[PDB]
Amino acid sequence: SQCSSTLVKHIKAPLHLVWSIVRRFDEPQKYKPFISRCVVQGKKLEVGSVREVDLKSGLPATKSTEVLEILDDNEHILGIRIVGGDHRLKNYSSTISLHSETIDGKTGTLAIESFVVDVPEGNTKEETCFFVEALIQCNLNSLADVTERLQAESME
Ligand SMILES: N#Cc1ccc(CS(=O)(=O)NC(=O)C2(c3ccsc3)CCCCC2)cc1
């Protein structure tokens, strides 16, 4: 009744720049294309911070409420739970972690995003798992696009 998996993305941008985007729990729309708004009252970037995101129109859900569980700036780990929303995901926990990597002399970042979530009522484990994996993979591909563009702009 639970399911889990892990997605990865090789990003052609330095860890420090990628982390500077990923750690913004209060502004996931910096790179998540399915978020239209994000409101965080109270303390913004501390364990326990709560965010309410509005999803972009035409999606099968419209809102999510999420809590920051882990914000490790030394190890570059961002841990988040979903606690409310009108999507079908219950007890969803997310962990994204970044690791520097060097491919052919070129330094970059390996992003690894893992999840755990309940298998919804009517849906199956494969159904839920495959759906979430595609969404995370899309989000990690947007992260690469955003940070690789920022890397390029920094090159003047
Ligand atoms: N139906 C549905 C649905 C579609 C888009 C979003 C916006 S989202 O694409 O930004 N959502 C995410 O990235 C997830 C997340 C990661 C850390 S906290 C929440 C991981 C992927 C599954 C949904 C939740 C949320 C729900």
Q: CATH number for the domain including 9? A: 3.30.530.20
What is the rounded CA–CA span in Å between residue 147 and residue 132? 22
Tally of structural domains, the chain: 1
Structure tokens at 115: 């999840």
Range of the domain at 15: 1-156
Q: Experimental method used, please? A: X-ray
Q: Which residues, 6+ apart, have CB-to-CB distance to 151 below 8 Å?
A: 12, 13, 14, 17
Resolution of the coordinates, Å: 2.0
Give the number of the atom of ligand 1 that is nearest the alpha carbon of residue 34. Answer: 7
Beta strands in the chain (DSSP E): 2-11, 35-39, 50-55, 63-72, 77-85, 93-103, 106-118
Structure tokens at 113: 């995003």
Yes or no: say if 21 and 155 are a contact pair by the CB < 8 Å rule. Answer: no
Cβ(135) – ligand 1 distance below 6 Å: yes
Cβ(150) – ligand 1 distance below 6 Å: no
Residue 134 alpha carbon to ligand 1 centre in Å: 11
